[PDB]
Design a protein around this ligand. Structure first.
Ligand SMILES: [Ca+2]
Ligand SMILES: [Ca+2]
Ligand SMILES: [Ca+2]
Ligand SMILES: [Ca+2]
Ligand SMILES: [Ca+2]
Length: 258
């Protein structure tokens, strides 16, 4: 099912199968000049797709399609709203696999903030180590229903654009680095995935077919030992440039809008 997650600046629709962001509205920004309709950044419609996907892949990650269906997470409620007397809104969802292992995925949103934390906890109830990588992917229709396209950053390269035309020509990115981020850009707004780990991340683009481009990251896998709990952290930026907030999330994220 879909759940609604709302703060003062974000209106998100999240699919509990996998935990992808299928729609994102920015209540504070007009859809069009002189409109009071909210700007729609992420969108899933028959004409257009622009989604922020994420999960746990690697050998034992439930979102790895070899491991079975995208995990259908359990939630406490269908609608989450930031309370007047709260600074933070947490949206925890839980999935138990066949073997009894527990996977918790939590979205954390803050008042006035366009950075959404997406964090995982993995409890290993079995007898073998669980090898897990987190991933974040931004996928979008190449042609719409000043630069529009993708970008990324590594500590070394700092800023790089990647054109949708290049992806459509099936020439794709495949680079690995500590730190870094990936993004999709348009005038005034960006979406970006930012891993928070100490490993070597893999950043890539893909042509997903039917005129859909993707950019994403896959983290270096970690091992969660039998009986142990493991944690994986990332941030989704979804909104306009806010220099101060962006700088604390990742170096040079401000270059996406600028
Ligand atoms: Ca299988
Ligand atoms: Ca398996
Ligand atoms: Ca270079
Ligand atoms: Ca460059
Ligand atoms: Ca270059």
């Amino acid at each position: 099912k879909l759940i609604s997650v709302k703060t003062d600046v974000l209106d998100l629709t999240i699919n509990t199968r996998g935990g992808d962001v299928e729609q994102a509205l920015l209540p504070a920004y007009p859809k069009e000049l002189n409109s009071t309709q909210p700007f729609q950044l992420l969108e899933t419609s028959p004409q257009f797709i622009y989604q922020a996907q994420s999960g746990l892949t690697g050998r034992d990650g439930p979102d790895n399609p070899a491991n079975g269906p995208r995990p259908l997470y359990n939630v406490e409620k269908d609608a989450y709203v930031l309370a007047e007397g709260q600074n933070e809104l947490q949206v925890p969802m839980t999935y138990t696999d066949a073997a009894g292992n527990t996977f918790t995925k939590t979205f954390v949103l803050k008042r006035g903030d366009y950075a959404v934390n997406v964090n995982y906890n993995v409890q290993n109830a079995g007898e073998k180590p669980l090898e897990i990588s987190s991933f974040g992917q931004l996928k979008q229709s190449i042609t719409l229903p000043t630069f529009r396209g993708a970008a990324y950053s590594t500590p070394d390269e700092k800023y790089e654009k990647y054109k949708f035309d290049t992806i459509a020509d099936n020439e794709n990115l495949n680079i690995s680095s500590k730190g870094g981020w990936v993004a999709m850009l348009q005038q005034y707004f960006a979406t970006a995935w930012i891993p928070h780990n100490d490993g070597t991340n893999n950043f890539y683009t893909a042509n997903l077919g039917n005129g859909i481009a993707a950019i994403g990251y896959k983290s270096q896998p970690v091992l969660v030992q039998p009986g142990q709990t493991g944690a994986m952290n990332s941030t989704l930026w979804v909104g306009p440039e806010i220099q101060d907030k962006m700088a604390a999330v990742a170096p040079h994220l401000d270059l996406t809008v600028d």
